[PDB]
Amino acid sequence: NITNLCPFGEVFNATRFASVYAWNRKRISNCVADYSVLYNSASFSTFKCYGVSPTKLNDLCFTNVYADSFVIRGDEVRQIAPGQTGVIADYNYKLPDDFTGCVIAWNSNNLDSKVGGNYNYLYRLFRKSNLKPFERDISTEIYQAGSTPCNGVKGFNCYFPLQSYGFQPTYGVGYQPYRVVVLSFELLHAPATVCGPK
């Protein structure tokens, strides 16, 4: 017997997480998904599933799984849910209205905040339109906020579209960095590729 376990370690324990605007996607397929690895964890700030019970995750098969991950600030984690609005849901990472899957987050202040501010983590503050679900925009075009053209240069009412969180360890809990993992579960008209343990 060969039991290819889905590499959830590579997702949850990654040393580096993506900026939310450049959110990372890892395909999870042709593997046994064993969620029991998370059962004895208690420092996740949120762990919610949509269309499936967390209690049944080891008892279900899916045609495909994606693991999306990124960093946002604590009071933005509420936007990583179906039917949300705000700067993250609108301009950075958009879940579908009928999302099937799980959203897990945890405070990463210790790893991701620096005295003086961590400027490595960015989000998109400006966009002409909202993202479609699971859309990614990594464009760096200067945003026209006023009546005057920008000509691809920063200036008055002409803003670089990405802005830094500048995470500092003494930020309020709502402004501290949180690492987020979104597990997307597909149930298409195709063979199951991801099942819980037998």
């Epitope: 933005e76 700067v87 301009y91 503050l125 906020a145 006023g146």
Partner: nanobody
Framework: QVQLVESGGGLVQPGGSLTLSCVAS????????VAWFRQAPGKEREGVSC??????????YYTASVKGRFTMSRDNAKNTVYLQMNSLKPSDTAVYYC?????????????????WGQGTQVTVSS
Amino acid sequence: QVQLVESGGGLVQPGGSLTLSCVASESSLAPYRVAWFRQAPGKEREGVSCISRDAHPTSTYYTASVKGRFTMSRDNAKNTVYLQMNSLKPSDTAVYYCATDLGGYCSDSNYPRAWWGQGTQVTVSS
């Protein structure tokens, strides 16, 4: 082409309250971030508060000096934003301006700065 008229300013004693109104004409404010700024003569413009298109507490920002004392809000049906000022100090004396731009969202560091009202004087004294 959006036009903004601040009102509600006047003389108030320390500890008193005031509600500023920023009424927009010629365009809808509803899709856009709006900010309150203030300027005392001699000192440059500074941001007071910023509200985003989602009008959520998490996307609404205040400068350190007014946190806990001032509340910004919007009524999209009246095309109007408010600054509720309680526990007014002498140091709150200034001309109050509202501004908007084409951004949907405030950041702590980036308020709208494209279109401005003429402003309303707020004086906290005897």
